[PDB]
Amino acid sequence: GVAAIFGPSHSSSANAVQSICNALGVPHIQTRWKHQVSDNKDSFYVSLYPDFSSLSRAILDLVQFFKWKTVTVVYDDSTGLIRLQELIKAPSRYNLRLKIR
């Protein structure tokens, strides 16, 4: 008999807990970002981690303020490519060249 679930941080376990809370009608709280399936029918969860589309637009705003032309982007895991897609597709909108390692 819990009233809400503060779920885990890893994305697969959080997806399983989110599907369980969606099926049982229980609120689910997320504190770390997970990559979201674009056509999921889930509506019973919230996430207080800041959305990386807005944070990547902030990154692009900072790049345009610092007036750069060649930018090397370095991540750690594969999911960072999902986490920085707005910066990745930002070429052919502005005069920005990306080298990605």
Ligand X SMILES: *[C@@H]1O[C@H](CO)[C@@H](O[C@@H]2O[C@H](CO)[C@@H](O[C@@H]3O[C@H](CO[C@H]4O[C@H](CO)[C@@H](O)[C@H](O)[C@@H]4O)[C@@H](O)[C@H](O[C@H]4O[C@H](CO)[C@@H](O)[C@H](O)[C@@H]4O)[C@@H]3O)[C@H](O)[C@H]2NC(C)=O)[C@H](O)[C@H]1NC(C)=O
> Where on the chain is the footprint of ligand X (CB under 6 A)?
53, 57, 61
Tell me which long-range contacts 76-82 makes (C-beta under 8 A, separation of at least 24).
79/11, 79/35, 82/35
Task: Output phi, psi for 81, to 5 deg.
Answer: -65, -35
Which of ligand X, a copy of itself, none does residue 69 bind (CB under 5 to 8 Å by kind)? Answer: none
In angstroms, give the least distance from the CB of 8 to a copy of itself.
Answer: 13
- Which residues form the interface with a copy of itself (CB under 8 A)? 10-12, 15-16, 19-20, 22-23, 35, 37-42, 77-79, 81-82, 85, 88-89, 91-92, 98-101
